[PDB]
Amino acid sequence: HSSLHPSIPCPRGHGAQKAALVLLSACLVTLWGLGEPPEHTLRYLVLHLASLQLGLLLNGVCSLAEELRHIHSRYRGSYWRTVRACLGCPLRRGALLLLSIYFYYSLPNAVGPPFTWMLALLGLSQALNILLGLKGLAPAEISAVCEKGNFNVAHGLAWSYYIGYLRLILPELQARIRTYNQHYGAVSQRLYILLPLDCGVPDNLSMADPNIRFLDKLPQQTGDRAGIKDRVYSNSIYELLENGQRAGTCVLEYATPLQTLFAMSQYSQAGFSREDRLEQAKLFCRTLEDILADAPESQNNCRLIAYQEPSFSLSQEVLRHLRQ
Amino acid sequence: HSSLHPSIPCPRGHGAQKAALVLLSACLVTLWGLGEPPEHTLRYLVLHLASLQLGLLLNGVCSLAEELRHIHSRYRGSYWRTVRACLGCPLRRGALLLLSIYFYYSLPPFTWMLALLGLSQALNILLGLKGLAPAEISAVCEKGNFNVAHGLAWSYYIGYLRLILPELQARIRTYNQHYGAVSQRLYILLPLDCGVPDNLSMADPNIRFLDKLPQQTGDRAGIKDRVYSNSIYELLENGQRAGTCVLEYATPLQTLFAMSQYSQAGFSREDRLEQAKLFCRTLEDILADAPESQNNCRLIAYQEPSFSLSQEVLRHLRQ
Amino acid sequence: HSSLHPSIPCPRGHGAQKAALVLLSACLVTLWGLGEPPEHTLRYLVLHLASLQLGLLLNGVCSLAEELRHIHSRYRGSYWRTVRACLGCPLRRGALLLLSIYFYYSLPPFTWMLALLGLSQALNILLGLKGLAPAEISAVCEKGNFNVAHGLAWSYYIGYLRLILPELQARIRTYNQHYGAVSQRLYILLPLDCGVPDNLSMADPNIRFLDKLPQQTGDRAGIKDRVYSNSIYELLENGQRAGTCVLEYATPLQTLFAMSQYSQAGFSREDRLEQAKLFCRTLEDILADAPESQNNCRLIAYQEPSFSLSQEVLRHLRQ
Amino acid sequence: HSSLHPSIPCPRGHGAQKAALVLLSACLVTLWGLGEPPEHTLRYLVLHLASLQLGLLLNGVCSLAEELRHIHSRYRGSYWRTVRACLGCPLRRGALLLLSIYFYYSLPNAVGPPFTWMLALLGLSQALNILLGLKGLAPAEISAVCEKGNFNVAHGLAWSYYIGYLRLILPELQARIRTYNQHYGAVSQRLYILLPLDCGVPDNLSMADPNIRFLDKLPQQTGDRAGIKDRVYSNSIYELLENGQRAGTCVLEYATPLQTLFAMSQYSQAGFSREDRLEQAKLFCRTLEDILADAPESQNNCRLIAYQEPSFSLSQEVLRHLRQ
Ligand SMILES: Nc1nc(=O)c2ncn([C@@H]3O[C@@H]4COP(=O)(O)O[C@H]5[C@@H](O)[C@H](n6cnc7c(N)ncnc76)O[C@@H]5COP(=O)(O)O[C@@H]3[C@@H]4O)c2[nH]1
Ligand SMILES: Nc1nc(=O)c2ncn([C@@H]3O[C@@H]4COP(=O)(O)O[C@H]5[C@@H](O)[C@H](n6cnc7c(N)ncnc76)O[C@@H]5COP(=O)(O)O[C@@H]3[C@@H]4O)c2[nH]1
Ligand SMILES: CC1(C)C(=O)N(Cc2c(F)cccc2Cl)c2cc(C(=O)NCc3c(F)cc(F)cc3F)ccc21
Ligand SMILES: CC1(C)C(=O)N(Cc2c(F)cccc2Cl)c2cc(C(=O)NCc3c(F)cc(F)cc3F)ccc21
């Protein structure tokens, strides 16, 4: 399960396969109840699968017509890769196509046209589906494909955040805090990152909640990156107020990628909607949590805070997590 | 068409529509040639569409059985939103379902056919007969912007370029007055191989550090005194300083390479290259439409086949 | 049974044979109960075996068509070796093939049956119907030692332990005479989580460096003056030095973790844990049978559930 | 292809699938030629596949009988994981089993016993195969599975060599060579590793070939590893002799994992044969080449030498590679 926030979706499971198994069992029971020639059941099932395979072949050919224009750039200028991407596994698909053709051209069929007439009708139906866009994928299927294939912006944002910022500072954060304390308050030993699922992320944190105010600045860290010599990473130690008293101080910061998502939502070229913004923010939080859990650099040296504004007091949540 | 590099794919067009039109024309021609009664053809076609619609309904039912668990988390506890996301539009889908059922029952067993169709759909779901080809996945991702490079490019624009391009001219003027005439453009390298070495000098001995710029300071994401820096490098030729300009390596390419190396990312090298190309293309587009950019930044893209980065940078510098 | 840790799998036994015996007994019982003529049962069984043999022959033929390309590289250009590696034993396999063909032709079409069997075998090869379950793969790998942990464990024994254990007593005696009474055993930590932090102190604040040992020198693999070192750490308890011993982290565990992180390795976390357990088990076995080891090394294995490494090490130290 | 040595096997391709496709086409052509009731072809094909699926079920049950003893340790003490590992994808396999049972119990069959009698005979055959070991995997299939699944010792040895030795020294090798040259011969700028496929690997390199003799020693490198503080990595600069003249000098070393493989071959508990030694050595060379090709640390800073003794002069090969 997920511990950051009850509103964070867990990874999709295998409920669809369970429902499919139940449906198959029910269909088999129904066919048994009907008590008609069983051979016909298998024959027509095979014919239907063959028709679907031929339709997939036609759709793949139509898609390949477009994909060929991009052979040189996208597909390394090789026709074999183009065919593989348009039709999948060439050999498996070819074997299935040959079986479908043979069975349909050979097996007697009472429901369905002969081979040539059936092929014409199938091509007609596939062309109509392509032209009218009648063949579309539901949002749930698209989301499942994206998550399974990791085709979501949040994945890239989280990996960028881990590889560009955390992976560098986190090992040296203990040393920097030690130096700051030895030279001078009694700050915590972990980095606290706030993850507003609403992606508000005000630039001036004190504006978000008066109870949090700036205290001091950690020593800067310098490192060479992307040709930019002496690139500087800096933190900011804040002080948390309870009834006007300094309850605790921590190295606190927000997640810039949430600002990026919010800005993308504001713009129009991005094609980014607010609902997509929320979904990608939740996915970003989940992915970052997983990466830090599996990461070696972060060994109880960083903590993440996730909250959703509904009455609301950021300072109270931060203090609650600190006192643990 | 993109002028950055010939190896940059262009946005997908409508060749599929043209192929569909050709297929439809040929299909109508052959249907005319066969000479069978039109009524039988219409019956067969409408029944085929009805069967497809019922299969889609069953697939949506299974997806609903799956998504009811995450109703609260992802769909905000609203059943109607879940149904919409699973089966599509409830209204149109239900109307098509009723029409399909009526046509199936009216036109000439019945229950056995429905059971067989459900069994076939279940087999498709379980064994994955009706998978999605990589081309279709790529088209869907590009159309819906369900890519990785899109987010990285917009992060780069909104975190770095949008916050230093306006002040880059002022910084360069300050450096020039304080002092080696550097150009007034930011040159960003876009290696499609996603190498991105930590130092230009190692990448090309013909390039070396010249001097930094006045660091820019700004508050960002609860971090005080966030500092953006740069590094004027000197471009050489035959040992003589040919020119100087601000040089950059697109860090998101570093991120893509690191994701490729790591197993937990689920990122392959082919995906790395494709997403790098997509990042370059979308960055070019956004900068072309950017208001902040007023021809104060130049995008340089190159691929290692031998290559001389200094020569390419100088060539872009002369123009 | 392995005494290192309860979470260490024991070598696979012969439960499959017992299950097969029970199944055979039940099958004979039901065959007796059915009462059908024995001759028909024999015919059916022998024809089934013949069909299986022909399927294996066809699979071997396809594998031969595949391996003829690598005949020169892997099989030294010998066709007979390739055939043996593909179809198994040519002599026995050919004899069984002839027997199967004769029985198929003699006992009561014929060519159609052979074509159908070939088609079924081709479908199995293409769509992968007859895949190998993970348990069978693991059993084959363990029986044939086609594992990763085996090589790492033997490398550790043959590169480090076999070259320092004989001289460890001398090194410890030299350190003691030069000077904090360190024990005369090498304590190797075996974290099944494959963490292996670079420093013990970070792993456990209750452990800190005490002193090095006299470096051992030897020539290895064309490298002169290869140096093996150690580091006596001090074990604490309530702030007082409870004991001292030479402490080690099994580097092969570091290698397994790194392989898990990297994508190019094709290594998953479950495989990482299983191979770590296998490495610990095989290391225990080889040391138990090692001539060089004369109870001068102790293997400590632990798993993080809270855990106090210092307490576990001290517990193993008292005994 | 492979460039280290023509005797290095390339990764296995998809020739088996091509042969299977050809076989399927030939079988379909034969069935067409026979011209008997096509329905029977499909019916008996389905029956045969169902029988195979039931046999796989029985074999998986027999294997599970043993695997259950290891549930707590190997399989995290969960029965579901045990069943998954014994039978594969539980839902897919269950659906196939249900289809097989239904079709066999329903479809009329002229060749083959009724459902119960057939099940008895199938269990008998599977039990006989298990008891007698008649069901075995050919060496080629085992090698393909191992390479595809990366279940070979050479994989681990190569990854250990890269992660423990190369990944550390290679970035600092240029600096060490620069310091050695500035303080004092004109050594090369790359590390040369020798990979004897025969795994001879003499400890004293000068013994291998007189023309190679020791010259000097590079500065030592120190780093903390596995709790061993100040662990030392050292190299050895040699001088290559042509006609008694110092043709060239290089930072040369052998691959210790080849020594490990040779020693494992010598022992008996290892269960390691000489042919397996050769195969794993070649696989180690190939894997290390791939890793270094994809590795960022090695940027034309290391070179590998592969040779096979058949007349033979190591110095000549090393010089030939150096002068490139
Ligand atoms: N709080 C905070 N303090 C920092 O010093 C810092 N440096 C990076 N980050 C954030 O971690 C992630 C890793 O950065 P990346 O290298 O991938 O690309 C960066 C980088 O290419 C560029 N950039 C941002 N800050 C600098 C900088 N100081 N110097 C050069 N380039 C910079 O613009 C991209 C995106 O910046 P942000 O989207 O605002 O947040 C980044 C980023 O999300 C920081 N976050
Ligand atoms: N030529 C050479 N010079 C070195 O300094 C060196 N250090 C390692 N290696 C080789 O690279 C690989 C990486 O070593 P790993 O850490 O995985 O396990 C090592 C390590 O756990 C241990 N070991 C070997 N040398 C030392 C050492 N000097 N200190 C501590 N442990 C050592 O024994 C294991 C295998 O040693 P080798 O099988 O002889 O060759 C190694 C290894 O194949 C070296 N090779
Ligand atoms: C599962 C079952 C029994 C079923 O419900 N249908 C729906 C259906 C029709 F689609 C067509 C007529 C009746 C029914 Cl009832 C079906 C179809 C076939 C088949 O052979 N389809 C080829 C095919 C067509 F039939 C028409 C077409 F325009 C193109 C095309 F390619 C096999 C089994 C079934
Ligand atoms: C491809 C084709 C036509 C074929 O060549 N055989 C070989 C064969 C026999 F195996 C058995 C008899 C004749 C032939 Cl000819 C076959 C078998 C079946 C079948 O139903 N097998 C179940 C089954 C058995 F038959 C016997 C048994 F001991 C156990 C068992 F589980 C279906 C199709 C075929």
Q: What is the pairing mode between strands A302-307 and A191-196?
A: parallel
Residue with tokens 């027999």, as numbered in its chain = D62
Picking from C1, C299, C317, C309, the residue whose alpha carbon sits closest to that of residue C153 is C299
Q: Mutation test of ligand 4: which of D40, D46, D48, D116 has the most ligand atoms closer than 8 Å to its C-beta?
A: D48
E strand intervals along B56-159: none
- Rounded to 10°, the helix A90-106/A79-87 angle is 60
Experimental method: cryo-EM
d(CA A104, CA A109): 8
SS3 call for B213: coil
**Phi, psi dihedral angles at D215 (to 5 degrees):** -115, -55
Contact between A248 and A215 (Cβ < 8 Å): no
Long-range contacts of D290-296 (CB under 8 A, 24+ apart): D290/C264, D291/C264, D291/D158, D291/D159, D291/D162, D292/D162, D292/D166, D294/C264, D295/D162, D295/D166, D295/D167, D296/B195, D296/B257, D296/B261
- Residue C313: CB partners within 8 Å, gap ≥ 6? C187, C189, C207, C235, C245, C247, C300
C127 CB near a chain A CB, below 8 Å?
yes
d(CA A191, CA A201): 17
Query: Measured in angstroms, how far is the CA atom of residue C308 from the centroid of ligand 2?
Result: 29
Residue with tokens 């007969």, as numbered in its chain = B129
Burial label for A270, CB within 10 Å (0-12, 13-18, 19+), is buried
d(CA A38, CA D108): 9
Picking from A293, A218, A285, the residue whose alpha carbon sits closest to that of residue A5 is A285
Is C92 labelled a binding residue?
A: no
d(CA B143, CA D29): 44
d(CA D5, CA D201): 18
Query: Measured in angstroms, how far is the CA atom of residue A50 from the centroid of ligand 3?
Result: 10
Phi/psi region, residue B8 (left: phi>0; alpha: psi -120 to 50; beta: rest), is beta
d(CA B5, CA D268): 59
Breaks (C-N over 2.5 A) in chain C follow: 108, 179, 305
* Signed CA dihedral, C265, C277, C147, D302: sign only: positive
Helix (H) or strand (E) holding A223: strand A221-225
Contact between D70 and C10 (Cβ < 8 Å): yes
Picking from B133, B279, B130, the residue whose alpha carbon sits closest to that of residue A66 is B133
Residue with tokens 């950690």, as numbered in its chain = A218
For residue B2 the two structure tokens come to 């993109």
For residue A221 the two structure tokens come to 């860290």
Q: In Å, how far from its chain's centre is CA A198? A: 17
HSE-CB at C107 with a 13 A cutoff on CA atoms is 18
Q: Considering only CA atoms, which residue is closest to atom 31 of ligand 4?
A: D122
Contact between D242 and D211 (Cβ < 8 Å): yes
For residue D315 the two structure tokens come to 């110095």
Nearest-atom number in ligand 1 for the CA of B228 is: 28
Residue type, D3: S
Residue D133: count other Cβ atoms within 10 Å of its Cβ: 8
Q: Which residues pair with B245 in a beta bridge?
A: B233
Ligand in nearest proximity to the CA of C186: 2
Phi/psi region, residue D230 (left: phi>0; alpha: psi -120 to 50; beta: rest), is left
Q: Considering only CA atoms, which residue is closest to atom 4 of ligand 1?
A: A233
HSE-CB at C77 with a 13 A cutoff on CA atoms is 2
D95 CB near a chain B CB, below 8 Å?
yes
The total number of residues shown for chain C amounts to: 319
Residue type, B312: E
d(CA A292, CA C159): 35
- Residue A233: CB partners within 8 Å, gap ≥ 6? A165, A168, A169, A220, A221, A222, A223
Distance from CA of B265 to the nearest CA of C (A): 8
- Closest-CA residue of D relative to C277 is D74
Q: Is the CB of D118 under 6 A from ligand 4?
A: yes
For residue C117 the two structure tokens come to 């069997």
Residue with tokens 């990042």, as numbered in its chain = B279
For residue A308 the two structure tokens come to 């959703």
Exposed e or buried b per residue across A221-257, where buried means at least 16 C-beta atoms within 10 angstroms of its C-beta: beeebbbbbebebbbbbbbbbeeeeebbbbbbbbbbb
**Phi, psi dihedral angles at D203 (to 5 degrees):** -65, -40
Maximum alpha-carbon separation in chain C: 92
**Phi, psi dihedral angles at B217 (to 5 degrees):** -120, 140
Ligand in nearest proximity to the CA of A123: 3
Contact between B148 and B142 (Cβ < 8 Å): no
- Rounded to 10°, the helix C79-87/C38-67 angle is 140
Contacts of D141 in chain C (CB under 8 A): 63
Picking from C30, C104, C140, the residue whose alpha carbon sits closest to that of residue D127 is C30
d(CA D283, CA D278): 9
CA distances from C233 to B166, C201, C212, C237, C260 (A): 58, 9, 9, 13, 29
Residue C296: count other Cβ atoms within 10 Å of its Cβ: 16
SS3 call for D193: strand
Helix (H) or strand (E) holding D241: strand D237-242
Q: Considering only CA atoms, which residue is closest to atom 2 of ligand 4?
A: C113
d(CA D238, CA D234): 13
Exposed e or buried b per residue across A165-191, where buried means at least 16 C-beta atoms within 10 angstroms of its C-beta: bbbbbbeebeebbeebeeeeeebeebb
HSE-CB at C270 with a 13 A cutoff on CA atoms is 8
Is D277 labelled a binding residue?
A: no
Query: Measured in angstroms, how far is the CA atom of residue C159 from the centroid of ligand 2?
Result: 7
Question: H helices within A68-202, ranges in order?
Answer: 79-87, 90-106, 115-132, 139-149, 153-161, 167-183
CA distances from B258 to B204, B251, B264 (A): 22, 11, 11
Give the closest of A91, A296, A299 to C126, CB-based.
A91
d(CA D58, CA D125): 10
Q: Which residues pair with D304 in a beta bridge?
A: D193
- Rounded to 10°, the helix A38-67/D90-106 angle is 140
CA distances from A241 to A193, A210, A237, B45, C248 (A): 18, 8, 13, 72, 47
Residue B94: count other Cβ atoms within 10 Å of its Cβ: 12
Residue A63: count other Cβ atoms within 10 Å of its Cβ: 23
Q: Is the CB of A165 under 6 A from ligand 1?
A: yes
SS3 content of chain C, % helix, strand, coil (to 5): 60, 15, 30
Residue type, D90: P
Exposed e or buried b per residue across D87-124, where buried means at least 16 C-beta atoms within 10 angstroms of its C-beta: bbbebebbbbbebbbbbbebbeeeebbeeebbbbbbbb
Picking from B277, B252, B279, B257, the residue whose alpha carbon sits closest to that of residue B268 is B257
Q: Which residues pair with A306 in a beta bridge?
A: A195
Residue type, D175: A
Phi/psi region, residue B231 (left: phi>0; alpha: psi -120 to 50; beta: rest), is beta
For residue B197 the two structure tokens come to 């070495």
CA distances from B266 to A245, B263, D135, D147 (A): 47, 6, 36, 21
Contact between D277 and D261 (Cβ < 8 Å): yes
Picking from D35, D45, D32, the residue whose alpha carbon sits closest to that of residue D103 is D45
Query: What single string gives the DSSP state of each residue in B262-314?
Result: BTTTT--HHHHHHHHHHHHHHHHHHHHT-SS-SS-EEEEEE------HHHHHH
Contact between A47 and B48 (Cβ < 8 Å): no
D91 CB near a chain B CB, below 8 Å?
yes
Contact between C236 and C206 (Cβ < 8 Å): yes
Contacts of A95 in chain C (CB under 8 A): 122-123, 126-127
Is D231 labelled a binding residue?
A: yes
First to last CA, chain D: 21
Burial label for D299, CB within 10 Å (0-12, 13-18, 19+), is middle
Contact between C232 and C245 (Cβ < 8 Å): yes
SS3 call for C304: coil
d(CA C115, CA C112): 5
The total number of residues shown for chain D amounts to: 324
Burial label for A285, CB within 10 Å (0-12, 13-18, 19+), is buried
Picking from B216, B257, B248, the residue whose alpha carbon sits closest to that of residue A232 is B216
d(CA A185, CA C273): 42
Contacts of A99 in chain C (CB under 8 A): 123
Exposed e or buried b per residue across B295-310, where buried means at least 16 C-beta atoms within 10 angstroms of its C-beta: ebbbbbbbeeeeeebb
Contact between C5 and C299 (Cβ < 8 Å): no
Picking from C136, A315, A41, the residue whose alpha carbon sits closest to that of residue D102 is A41
For residue D167 the two structure tokens come to 């990944």
CA distances from B74 to A9, A275, B114, C141 (A): 6, 10, 33, 43
SS3 call for C314: helix
Contact between A228 and B250 (Cβ < 8 Å): no
CA distances from C261 to A291, B101, D86, D226 (A): 11, 53, 27, 18
Picking from B222, B71, D174, D131, the residue whose alpha carbon sits closest to that of residue C24 is D131
Question: H helices within C148-268, ranges in order?
Answer: 149-156, 162-178, 200-203, 251-261
d(CA D142, CA C67): 13
A-B Cβ pairs (cutoff 8 Å, strict) = 375
The total number of residues shown for chain A amounts to: 324
SS3 call for A237: strand
Query: What single string gives the DSSP state of each residue in B229-246?
Result: --EEEEEEETTEEEEEEE
d(CA D285, CA D10): 12
Residue B178: count other Cβ atoms within 10 Å of its Cβ: 8
Q: Which residues pair with A222 in a beta bridge?
A: A232
E strand intervals along B121-163: none
